[PDB]
Design an enzyme around this catalytic site. Structure first.
Site: not given
Ligand SMILES: O=C(NCC1(c2nc(-c3ccccc3)cs2)CCOCC1)c1cccc(-c2noc(C(F)(F)F)n2)c1
Ligand SMILES: [K+]
Ligand SMILES: [K+]
Ligand SMILES: [Zn+2]
Ligand SMILES: [Zn+2]
Length: 368
Positions: A18, A20, A26, A85, A137
């Site tokens: 990410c 941020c 994360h 964020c 997933h």
């Protein structure tokens, strides 16, 4: 190329993070694969293996598992959701770097595929893919749970479509259910999917993978969910997973008799993962031993791909034991006390549910 264990790693996959920059917020961070990679060198296992960089998965390879819209969204360059964020993502957990995430996800898919082909062709004995982001997933048209493309499912599909393996066993011992992998191969009897996961009657991510979900059409009975219920007390660990392998996983795997074994190797069932991340107590020695057991199938054709696992020590320990197993180091079952303990009542009842359901399909599950 020498006939030893293969290792997949490349810095490209470190780029997935990410904007941020907070690796605490994360938790699926670059340090995961970075720590494992250096750990393998520190312990002397990395030099013994044939180390490969891997490659990008082609759009065609991604489309063998995912929809056109999915592959356009996450697979291609735009020139062709907001978070608390500040960064962009598909959801609060599954972040998206607009410059690097696609390349990293495509590299993880391509590298697991590249490794599986080399193991399938028997250029390599077996392999371990130190890849991120995870894949199991990610379903046909949904990125979720830190996953974008199902690397293991893509590798499996490509092995089939290029005629390098008739029957393929996918074992997924990550603590979460591989909803994407189950969906992809639900109607296919040439692929056997065996998952061990915390289910707790649907009250744990992703919420799927009940014992009743056995597949459909021609693929009925070829989807095996070892869905643990009961909770975290009494503790779930080595005796329960060892029992799962003796009673369900290996007997069905041997009756299926695969030509190649793929492993969604998450280590979030290991010690050091509290609830609601895992809350299980599987030791590193057990992971390496489970690996050793799968090496008896498919004439040794085994490929592990990293999925989950946060605790750096826990996933490094576990990754080490699996690679050592791959290289031929054997674990003596009598060398560890605690493995002498019987599995807890919750695990026995869960396996009872697995046996009762799959007695319709498998001879090794059929009893009086
Ligand atoms: O409930 C979940 N996570 C819990 C929190 C954590 N997620 C991790 C984590 C670290 C590395 C990889 C994946 C998850 C650590 S904590 C989420 C936000 O912070 C507090 C708890 C959750 C939700 C969806 C997916 C997953 C998940 N874990 O491994 C995997 C993977 F795909 F197998 F890699 N998916 C986990
Ligand atoms: K699983
Ligand atoms: K299946
Ligand atoms: Zn962020
Ligand atoms: Zn997981």
């Amino acid at each position: 190329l020498p006939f030893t264990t293969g290792l997949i790693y490349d810095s490209v996959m470190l780029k997935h993070q990410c904007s941020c920059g907070d690796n605490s917020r994360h938790p699926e961070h670059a340090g995961r694969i970075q720590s494992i990679w250096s750990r393998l060198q520190e312990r002397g296992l990395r030099s013994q293996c044939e180390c490969l960089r891997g490659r990008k998965a082609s759009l065609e390879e991604l489309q063998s598992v995912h929809s056109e819209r999915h592959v356009l969204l996450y697979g291609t360059n735009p020139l062709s959701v907001m978070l608390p964020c500040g960064g962009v993502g598909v959801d609060t957990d599954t972040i998206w770097n607009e410059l690097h995430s696609s390349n990293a996800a495509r590299w993880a898919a391509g590298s697991v595929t590249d490794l599986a082909f080399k193991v399938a062709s028997r250029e390599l004995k077996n392999g371990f893919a130190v890849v991120r982001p995870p894949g199991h997933h990610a379903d046909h048209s949904t990125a979720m749970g830190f996953c974008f493309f199902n690397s293991v499912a893509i590798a499996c599909r490509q092995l089939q479509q290029q005629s390098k393996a008739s029957k393929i066993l996918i074992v997924d011992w990550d603590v979460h259910h591989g909803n994407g992998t189950q969906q992809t191969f639900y109607q296919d009897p040439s692929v056997l999917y065996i998952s061990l996961h915390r289910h707790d009657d649907g009250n744990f991510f992703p919420g799927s993978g009940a014992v009743d979900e056995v597949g459909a059409g021609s693929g009925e009975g070829f989807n095996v969910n070892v869905a643990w219920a009961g909770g975290l007390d009494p503790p779930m660990g080595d005796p329960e997973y060892l029992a799962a392998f003796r009673i369900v996983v290996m007997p069905i795997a041997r009756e299926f008799s695969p030509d190649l074994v793929l492993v969604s190797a998450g280590f979030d069932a290991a010690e050091g993962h509290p609830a609601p991340l895992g809350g299980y107590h599987v030791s590193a020695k057990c992971f390496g031993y489970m690996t050793q057991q799968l090496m008896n199938l498919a004439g040794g054709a085994v490929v592990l791909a990293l999925e989950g696992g946060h605790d750096l020590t826990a996933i490094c320990d576990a990754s080490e034991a699996c690679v050592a197993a791959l290289l031929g180091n054997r674990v003596d079952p009598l060398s560890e006390e605690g493995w002498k303990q019987k599995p807890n009542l919750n695990a026995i009842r869960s396996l009872e549910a697995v046996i009762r359901v799959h007695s319709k399909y498998w001879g090794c599950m059929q009893r009086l």
